[PDB]
């Protein structure tokens with residue numbers, strides 16, 4: 001028992017982190033096979049932050065201007081290209097530590113682990129969710145760009161995020177590994193609206209199921225509700241509308257606990273309307289939405 | 305900016321995880337140099353859980369009864385011995401992935417990362433604190449024994465915890481890497497009192513400093529207090545008494561924010577007496593105590 005915001009083991013990703021420098025700018029890159037992937041804003045200067053012409057900036061750069069270091073050893077760059085907001089630096093050596101991998105564009109509400117890095121060196125690992133508004137609530141400082149988010153399925157690393165920027169509001173934005181930003185964000189030092197962030201209802205319910213499995217049952221009530229009645233409450237509290245697809249995804253947790261999904265919805269409706277009354281659930285005083293139903297089953301089953 | 309419960313990158317520890325089986329019992333071991341460390345209760349059966357005589361049980365075991373597997377390959381056991389509550393299995397091969405390491409017995413209130421493992425395979429990584437009552441609030445299932453807690457200082461892994469058991473209350477207990485339990489716990493399937501768990505005051509203050517650094521300042525007030533006045537409040541709320549050593553440790557955070565430690569104490573006193581009033585601090589609705597002042601400086605400075 002016990003429920004923690006667990007991240008995937010980061011070893012397979014640590015073995016891919018390299019440092020990329022262009023001019024005076026240093027950030028992190030991801031070395032997979034003979035390619036190093038990094039945010040294209042590595043080619044920017046102080047005067048090229050508010051409105052960069054990446055195509056024009058990149059034209060002034062040659063292979064030897066991109067310094068890539070893996071640990072203490074220098075990688076030789078034999079090609080460079082821009083794919084959306086990422087640069088792909090072809091190096092003469094395939095990463096010997098390259099794990100089995102995939103590039104995936106995750107759905108909002110899905111979770112992933114982030115390996116925060118500085119100067120190509122890993123500093124820490126944490127679990128987070130892609131918010132419905134396509135931002136992440138990470139922990140990133142200057143130099144963390146190019147740090148990646150990923151999921152692990154047995155031996156395969158699915159890379160889903162590359163860190164590009166911090167919005168003036170302290171939230172984070174970035175791209176998939178094809179360089180396409182999640183959300184409406186652009187790699188420019190301008191004010192950008194993140195948008196209203198809703199609560200991932202299916203994740204809150206999954207966490208309530210985790211709470212029941214882990215002994216926390218005070219919030220369970222004698223009520224039930226309907227999807228339409230529940231959603232009237234969810235709308236009022238800026239919660240994502242729950243659909244039959246979400247109910248179906250909660251099926252295994254509903255079967256394990258013996259609590260019907262609409263019954264758990266009535267517990268959630270009462271918690272929203274009444275608050276926690278100074279009480280806690282899984283060591284938390286607010287409703288947690290950064291655990292998917294898959295994360296709950298995984299943590300409560302011991303998938304390695 | 306952003307503040308997350310960050311764990312150390314786990315790669316160096318993943319490379320040390322092995323599976324140990326004795327009879328019908330399988331758990332995890334830690335392979336460092338030519339020794340595999342594991343909980344001694346691996347030699348127990350169902351009838352040897354309530355009151356095991358480890359010395360007598362171990363006498364019926366020979367080297368070939370300990371099956372150690374590193375990935376898919378079998379390790380040859382050439383020696384075995386019991387040191388307190390851990391077994392040390394000497395194998396004929398030194399772990400080629402052995403990192404620079406230390407065995408340390410951590411102080412209550414200090415934090416560490418746990419790499420939860422099953423069958424010698426890592427499942428996840430999370431950060432936790434050694435509670436003042438010498439328990440940990442982990443996430444562990446059957447088969448997780450032998451999973452370890454550690455800290456990383458540049459390239460050196462300081463192992464501080466080995467998982468041994470779950471108390472009937474859902475909290476976790478275990479040993480340092482010399483096999484000495486943290487707290488009064490014994491490796492027996494009997495009811496064991498954990499003791500009153502207090503809140504790590506110096507950690508709550510460190511987290512309040514992290515909140516200020518990360519923009520959350522609503523809780524800051526126009527008041528100050530004294531160590532003795534603060535401790536009268538801390539006692540009432542089952543908080544550890546704050547000492548000058550704790551004030552001195554908060555010195556760098558006090559200097560970075562320009563907020564005197566006793567001024568932050570008055571903010572903490574008011575939060576304890578008045579509650580959060582439905583507000584949050586660093587995405588939390590309760591006062592967080594599992595970040596040390598060192599963790600706050602590290603996360604807010606980017607130590608790799």
Ligand SMILES: O=C(c1cncc2ccccc12)N1CCN(c2ccccc2)CC1
Pocket residue numbers: 041044048049140141142143144145164165166187188189305
């Ligand atoms: O290293 C960072 C950064 C990232 N994440 C969190 C942070 C927190 C505080 C300070 C800086 C950061 N930046 C910020 C984006 N930046 C950039 C440059 C050109 C075009 C678009 C973006 C490059 C430098």
Ligand SMILES: O=C(c1cncc2ccccc12)N1CCN(c2ccccc2)CC1
Pocket residue numbers: 001345348352353444445446447448449468469470491492493
């Ligand atoms: O694998 C575990 C375990 C550990 N952590 C969390 C758990 C949650 C649910 C179920 C089991 C566990 N045990 C529990 C202790 N156990 C043991 C045997 C002899 C003497 C002393 C301890 C060996 C088997």
